[PDB]
Amino acid sequence: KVEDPKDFPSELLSFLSHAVFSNRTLACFAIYTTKEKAALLYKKIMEKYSVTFISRHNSYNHNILFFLTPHRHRVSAINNYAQKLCTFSFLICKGVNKEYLMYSALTRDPFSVIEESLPGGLKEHD
Amino acid sequence: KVEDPKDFPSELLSFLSHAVFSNRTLACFAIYTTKEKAALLYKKIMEKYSVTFISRHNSYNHNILFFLTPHRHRVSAINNYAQKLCTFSFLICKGVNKEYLMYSALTRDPFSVIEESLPGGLKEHD
Amino acid sequence: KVEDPKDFPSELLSFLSHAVFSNRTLACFAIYTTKEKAALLYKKIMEKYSVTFISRHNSYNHNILFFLTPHRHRVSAINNYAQKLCTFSFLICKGVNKEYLMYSALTRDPFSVIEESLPGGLKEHD
Amino acid sequence: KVEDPKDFPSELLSFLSHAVFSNRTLACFAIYTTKEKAALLYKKIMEKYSVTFISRHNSYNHNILFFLTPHRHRVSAINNYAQKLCTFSFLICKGVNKEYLMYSALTRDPFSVIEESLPGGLKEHD
Amino acid sequence: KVEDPKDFPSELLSFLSHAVFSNRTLACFAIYTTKEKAALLYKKIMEKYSVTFISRHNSYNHNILFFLTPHRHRVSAINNYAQKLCTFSFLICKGVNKEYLMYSALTRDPFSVIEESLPGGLKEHD
Amino acid sequence: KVEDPKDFPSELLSFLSHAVFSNRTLACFAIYTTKEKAALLYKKIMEKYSVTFISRHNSYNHNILFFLTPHRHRVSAINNYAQKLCTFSFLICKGVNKEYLMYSALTRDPFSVIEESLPGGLKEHD
């Protein structure tokens, strides 16, 4: 009933690349989508991209997925994969420029960890 | 029952390359075909060419696909791929010289967006 | 039951290179073979050689394939590819020196187009 | 009721790589998890990774799995596989730098072998 | 049960280079080997060396392969390729100095053509 | 259990260059290593260096590889290649100054041929 988000929460924008059409490849990504779709994508992305790390977070009654990949990918490729699997009410997929700061913000108010593939993520490792 | 189109709608022709046999490679393409075939090709092209962006549009009771690719391709290669997958009543595949102007025209009367891989496409990004 | 052709139809010979062992590379080729084998090779050659254009034609109860390639190849390489895929009752593979005149002759009595990857081929484009 | 382990037993730490996010690939791994989950993973990992060798060990009322693989893998890939199959109360997955010393320690107090795919493991072979 | 041949049939020796260790490169070669191995090598050599022409011949209950290549190769390189693919009871690989005379002899008693990539080979072309 | 050899067998030393660090390039080489590693290197070196000739020999419960190359190489380059592929218990790589005498000695007691790329090697050719 509320209009879907058109971007990530304002407080996270500095950490992201907004050049969604770029040919540049990255190894850290974030997805903003619904709670149900993020739960599904957590598992699918983990396997598809053989993630180094993935976490799922509460964000304003929606969810954010955050992940690191062992190989580099274009943001559009990640976006295309999400769309191959599901229809979405909304889906925002962006590269992450500031990996540690993004993950750290996602663990603290107003965000919180739902699940992650390594306890404590980037706060505790590498 | 109406004769199939032999080219893109006249108002879009300026935006396209008409040198369909060229060895030149491009990174933006358009396909004019039936509503049913364009729906199928939307998904197949998205994956095959790992598109930067793809959109599907209403056009005179048919559909136009518009897409950007992260690597360059010959127009004939795109044409060959469409034909590997399906038989068509009609299929017109051309390179796009004016990416932004083509996409913009396809969002406005007499054209309209059916679906796209990023909301607002080239009007909102890059 | 009739002896297989030992060359292309006499009326097409002027358009062809007969130096089948040449190291020279070309970008236009023709194949004379059976109706069944040409139907198969149409699809396989289209993909293998990423053809600029390909057409299949009726010729005296057999078929002729005509194609343009974006890269240059030796005639023997095309011949070897046909033979990797299938056994043939007969197969004649030659380079084409006169691309437009060959295609044009193949569209008119005593020849006719069965299928092609672009409507009207070289009569309508480049 | 006791807090789950947050790492391998202190006496084994020297043998392990702690760079869990590394892109480096290894061919020897260890997993610390519950007795029930290790029993299951023993069989699943054996098949999934076509292990050269696998052993399961008592460790402080939990279990350690130790395995060698014929191909190299990232530690995170092993971690992701465990998590695809099951939910865990705890799961610690690390690469092993000192294969022989790790296996040897796991056979002696305070550790003991429960089962292994070759009797005597690395003490008796290669 | 009969001792394998130690060279090509005596009547063909004049046509061959016997300097098997030479650094000189050639573009015509012959292989003497078993019927089974020659059948296999016919296909593999055709593709590996993108042959201008290849033929397989009956020779004293064995087979001879004869081929022309579009690029030059050392005889030892051809020999090494045969040996990469298969073990042989016997394999003799030599450069051919007299291309036309060798092919011609291989088509006539006591030799005969089994298969070739162009009907009539060097008797009918170039 | 016996200490690995620190050089080639004493009776072969006269045939070899001992200047392993030399910038001089040669076209004949020998490798002393284990039976298992020599079997593997036989195939890999044959292809890597497009050998004119290669042979593998029994030597005091180990193996010697002997090969001629069509291009010249530094001994250290050959040594580096062996080490790129495998770990070795021992590996001695030297240039050969006396090609024919080295090969001849390797065919006679106390040495013997295991396999070679041309029957009789340098005793029968060039």
UniProtKB/Swiss-Prot annotation, chains A, B, C, D, E, F:
Phosphorylated on both serine and threonine residues. Small t antigen inhibits the dephosphorylation by the AC form of PP2A. Residues 9-124 bind DNA. Signal peptide: none annotated. It is found in: Host nucleus. The sequence shown is that of strain 776. Isoform large T antigen is a key early protein essential for both driving viral replication and inducing cellular transformation. Plays a role in viral genome replication by driving entry of quiescent cells into the cell cycle and by autoregulating the synthesis of viral early mRNA. Displays highly oncogenic activities by corrupting the host cellular checkpoint mechanisms that guard cell division and the transcription, replication, and repair of DNA. Participates in the modulation of cellular gene expression preceeding viral DNA replication. Isoform 17kT antigen targets host RBL2 for degradation and promotes cell proliferation. Transactivates host cyclin A promoter through its J domain. The J domain is essential for multiple viral activities, including virion assembly, viral DNA replication, transformation and transcriptional activation. The LXCXE motif specifically binds to host pRB, RBL1, and RBL2. Isoform large T antigen forms homohexamers in the presence of ATP. Interacts with host HDAC1. Interacts (via LXCXE domain) with host RB1; the interaction induces the aberrant dissociation of RB1-E2F1 complex thereby disrupting RB1's activity. Interacts (via LXCXE domain) with host pRB-related proteins RBL1 and RBL2. Interacts (via C-terminus) with host TOP1 and POLA1 allowing DNA replication. Interacts with host TP53, inhibiting TP53 binding to DNA. Interacts with host preinitiation complex components TBP, TFIIA and TFIID to regulate transcription initiation. This is Large T antigen. It comes from Simian virus 40 (SV40). The lineage of its organism: Viruses, Monodnaviria, Shotokuvirae, Cossaviricota, Papovaviricetes.
